[PDB]
Design a protein around this nucleic acid. Structure first.
Ligand SMILES: [Mg+2]
Ligand SMILES: [Mg+2]
Ligand SMILES: [Mg+2]
Ligand SMILES: [Mg+2]
Ligand SMILES: [Mg+2]
Ligand SMILES: [Mg+2]
Ligand SMILES: [Mg+2]
Ligand SMILES: [Mg+2]
Ligand SMILES: [Mg+2]
Ligand SMILES: [Mg+2]
Ligand SMILES: [Mg+2]
Ligand SMILES: [Mg+2]
Ligand SMILES: [Mg+2]
Ligand SMILES: [Mg+2]
Ligand SMILES: [Mg+2]
Ligand SMILES: [Mg+2]
Ligand SMILES: [Mg+2]
Lengths: 128, 215, 109, 51, 225
RNA sequence: CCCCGCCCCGGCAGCAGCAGCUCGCCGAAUCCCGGGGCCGAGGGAGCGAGACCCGUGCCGCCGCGCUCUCCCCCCUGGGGGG
RNA sequence: GGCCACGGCGUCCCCCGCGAGCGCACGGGGUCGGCGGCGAUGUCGGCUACCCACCCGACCCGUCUUGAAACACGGACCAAGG
RNA sequence: CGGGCCCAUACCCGGCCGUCGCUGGCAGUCGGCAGAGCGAGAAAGAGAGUGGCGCGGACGCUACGCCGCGACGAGUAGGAG
């Protein structure tokens, strides 16, 4: 019985594919990290038909659902137990997230305290 | 005072037939002018106590939703106005199109309070029992039965027909079906070949176009 | 004990000469060859039936190989009897010139 | 907050909210059309009887 | 005490309600009066024409003083003078409509903008449909839909036009404050002409759509709404 | 078949005609009904008592019907009406 | 015959400031006080990421230039420096 | 020459994103020591005085915050946030 958020609206994303850097498929030195094309003759920059799209501001997501995980919560990185009383009073809207650097003996304690406090943990059985 | 039926006949929806002062005259408002708990004491065995019929909540959630802006035209399903196609009248022959009885000609009896048609079907003819169907998923053929001289028991309704929870046929259902079917069979035996038509199954063959054939 | 669905062909997508709109499909129903004759089929729901490798659950039966994408006939197209159909998932382009079942039960006769 | 605009040509109560006389105007129109239709049909019936 | 304060508040609310009822009766009677005035207007011209025909002479009706103008062509490639006159006519986008009162100056401006507009003489029904269906106001330089009579009253009551009925009256039978009424009215944002146009680039007389349709603008309005 | 004058424009139907198409422009001189498709954005608008009250969650504008008047009619105390 | 934002008394001059209740809704943006199925070793869900197919679109970048896909120049590929 | 039909990022209706403007609104969360309001055609007081039982009331306001109305959205060289 997973914990539920206060409300779970239907999250709508205007795009699910990522904006890949132009011509990154033809080279290995070119990562897919988006760089704006600035060439004088660049058809991608000139917005020709059937080319790679560019990240307009019109793709911005709804503010009511922005950053919402598919579970309906919003993530918060926590490093120790004392940072869970922070989410104590944001119980139904915000979940917890244990850092990769925390060791197993402390992850057990964080998970136990969160279970006591009814705060959701997105990676509760990570290391064991 | 004893209530009276509305004195303003409707012309169309929302428009009464008579004017404002015409209704004033009809109501005769000229001669009707007018002018200007919480706690109960429950005895106890030192003195008496005051009991609270309402107790404050013992737990408050972390957060709660605000109230909703309230609209006007939205109603529960129980009281929507229910409509029926003109081609469907009691006694017409329908064609079932969705369920396990798809394509079987049947007989229409009445429309229930939930808007679902009450179909009988003769068990001796096509093994269709007293069943509900949806008005949309049927075809109304142009064949009628003089069913007006048939009485359907009142007790059978949507509450009767609704699913309860392996399914066993009850004796109440069997006797209700026996009564209705014994009432309906002779009236359709009076139309030649009608029993065979009801027993057959409708289907589409080569070159037969639904938009060209009069049903 | 027979066919209860009309025969239609997925002709292609809503398009111009050089632009394709995949969310709308064009259908040829047999026997209808006129805009004024297509009126019977507006609002009827249509289905595309195909087979895959592994099984999927079916309503009222044991799982089998069949899968279905559902649709609905929206409005007529041209003068020769085309209609426009909108499916809850865009029809795959491999279904060009294949059979689309057009049902009868959303009926208003 | 912003209100939703409703077409008064199609919405009777909105039309009345912007012009209360529309109600009596439409009632007079409906009654006159009904009377004219009845007169036409009875005149045609009398003419065909007299034929 | 609060005993008389409550009754004072209730009396105030009663006064507001009585004033509102008075205003409603006033606007209802004004609407009825306008209906009769329109009927007299419509029968008078027919009667005058009939009496002229009986006498054997001709009756030339007064040339119309109101016009409805629609921008036909787009924004690309426009002469500076044509652009300026369109801006002054309040047609800054394709398919905007605007009532215009007709005098020598306005007629000359329309002659200048002849290739870029289609215009004519609207009907009373055309005015009604345009005002009710697509009528927006300019309130605090904002485009606000006219969803009640108080928006018109607060911005035009000083000119003694209280409702959309006498707003339509002013626009149809242009009065002393037609300029203010038209300036209050935001430019109408009509849609594309359903059923197609004949030819955008050519005058109406040559079978196109530019120029001055006399009273075919009513058909054009029926299609564009 | 086409013309003149007299017969009340000779009279009778009707009438931009369901002889569904011989030729128009319309709607303050316009209303009613029905079908197909797409959409559901927002979320504490208050109502009533009130220093005698501490309810309630249908609220504003707008359009209405019934009772605090009394008779009568119809179909079965109920509904439909004058 | 048909219609209506007509509806008391009191005089003075003209012609001739608070009724009570209820209920319905074309009324400041959707609700149901409506339902049906299928789920343990083969099924359910996963708009993204892996492979493949189909339809439509789609010429290689940077650069000078009025004009670049150019039969204009620089560029085999990768890492670090710049 | 006539009806019908096809579609652009154009126009209309609707949702969402941002910018601009209203140099718009909110310190009023003033609660038993209490009395719920400032949206509505037309200036300015829920003005003060002088004589004729049961103990109850959601969220909010990192004011560099939150909220509401409309309009607008091409871009090399270049500028700014
Ligand atoms: Mg260039
Ligand atoms: Mg098979
Ligand atoms: Mg051009
Ligand atoms: Mg069309
Ligand atoms: Mg190609
Ligand atoms: Mg290629
Ligand atoms: Mg160079
Ligand atoms: Mg050169
Ligand atoms: Mg180049
Ligand atoms: Mg060359
Ligand atoms: Mg060389
Ligand atoms: Mg060189
Ligand atoms: Mg080289
Ligand atoms: Mg480097
Ligand atoms: Mg828009
Ligand atoms: Mg734009
Ligand atoms: Mg820009």
């Amino acid at each position: 019985a997973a914990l539920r958020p206060l409300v779970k609206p239907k999250i709508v994303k205007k795009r699910t594919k990522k904006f890949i850097r132009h011509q990154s498929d033809r080279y290995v030195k070119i990562k897919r990290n988006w760089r704006k094309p600035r060439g004088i003759d660049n058809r991608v920059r000139r917005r020709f038909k059937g080319q790679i799209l560019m990240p307009n501001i019109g793709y911005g997501s709804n503010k009511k659902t922005k950053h919402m995980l598919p579970s309906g919560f919003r993530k918060f990185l926590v490093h120790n137990v004392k940072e869970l009383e922070v989410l104590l009073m944001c119980n139904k809207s915000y979940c917890a997230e244990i850092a990769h650097n925390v060791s197993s003996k402390n992850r057990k304690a964080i998970v136990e305290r969160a279970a006591q406090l009814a705060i959701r943990v997105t990676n509760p059985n990570a290391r064991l | 005072g004893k209530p009276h039926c509305s004195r303003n006949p409707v012309l169309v929806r929302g428009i009464g037939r008579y004017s404002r002062s015409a209704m004033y005259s009809r109501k005769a408002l000229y001669k009707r002018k007018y002018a200007a708990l919480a706690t109960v004491t429950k005895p106890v065995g030192g003195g008496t106590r005051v009991v609270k019929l309402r107790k404050m909540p013992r737990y408050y959630p972390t957060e709660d939703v605000p109230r909703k802006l309230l609209s006007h035209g939205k109603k529960p399903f129980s009281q929507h106005v229910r409509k029926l196609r003109a081609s469907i009248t009691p006694g017409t022959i329908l064609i079932i199109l969705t369920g396990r009885h798809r394509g079987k000609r049947v007989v229409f009896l009445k429309q229930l309070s939930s808007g679902l048609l009450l179909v009988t079907g003769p068990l001796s003819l096509n093994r269709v029992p007293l069943r509900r169907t949806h008005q949309k998923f049927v075809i109304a053929t142009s064949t009628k039965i003089d069913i007006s001289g048939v009485k359907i028991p009142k007790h059978l309704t949507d509450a009767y027909f609704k699913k309860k929870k392996k399914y066993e046929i009850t004796e109440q259902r069997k006797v209700d079906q026996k009564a209705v079917d014994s009432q309906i069979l002779p009236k359709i035996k009076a139309v030649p070949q009608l029993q065979g038509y009801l027993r057959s199954v409708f289907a589409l063959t080569n070159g037969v176009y639904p938009h060209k054939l009069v049903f | 004990s027979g066919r209860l669905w009309c025969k239609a062909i997925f002709a292609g997508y809503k398009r111009g000469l050089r632009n394709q709109r995949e969310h709308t499909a064009l259908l040829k129903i047999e026997g209808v060859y006129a805009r004024d004759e297509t009126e019977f089929y507006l609002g009827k729901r249509c289905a595309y039936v195909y087979k895959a490798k592994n099984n999927t659950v079916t309503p009222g039966g044991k799982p089998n190989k069949t899968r279905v994408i559902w649709g609905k006939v929206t409005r007529a197209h041209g003068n020769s009897g085309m209609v426009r159909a909108k499916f809850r998932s865009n029809l795959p382009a491999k279904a060009i010139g294949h059979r689309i079942r057009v049902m009868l039960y959303p009926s208003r006769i | 907050r912003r209100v939703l605009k409703k077409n008064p040509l199609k919405n009777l109560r909105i039309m009345l909210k912007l012009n209360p006389y529309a109600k009596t105007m439409r009632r007079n129109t409906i009654l006159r059309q009904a009377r004219n239709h009845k007169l036409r049909v009875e005149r045609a019936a009398a003419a065909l009887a007299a034929k | 005490n609060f005993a008389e304060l409550k009754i004072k508040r209730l009396r105030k609310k009663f006064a507001q309600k009585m004033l509102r009822k008075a205003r409603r009766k006033l606007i209802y009677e004004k609407a009825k009066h306008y209906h009769k005035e329109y009927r007299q207007m419509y029968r008078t011209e027919i009667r005058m024409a009939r009496m002229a025909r009986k006498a054997g002479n001709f009756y030339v009706p007064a040339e119309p003083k109101l016009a409805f103008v629609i921008r036909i062509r787009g924004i690309n490639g426009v002469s500076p003078k044509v652009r300026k006159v369109l801006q002054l006519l309040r047609l800054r986008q394709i398919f905007n409509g605007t009532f215009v009162k007709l005098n020598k100056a306005s007629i000359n401006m329309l002659r200048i903008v002849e290739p870029y507009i289609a215009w004519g003489y609207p009907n009373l029904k055309s005015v009604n449909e345009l005002i009710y269906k697509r009528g927006y106001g300019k309130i605090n330089k904002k485009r606000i839909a006219l969803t009640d009579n108080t928006l018109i009253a607060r911005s035009l009551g000083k000119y003694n036009i209280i409702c959309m009925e006498d707003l339509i009256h002013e626009i149809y039978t242009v009065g002393k404050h037609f300029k203010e009424a038209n300036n209050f009215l935001w430019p109408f944002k009509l849609s594309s002409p359903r059923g197609g146009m004949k030819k955008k680039t050519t005058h109406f007389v040559e079978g196109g759509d530019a120029g001055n349709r006399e009273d075919q603008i009513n058909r054009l309005i029926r299609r564009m709404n």
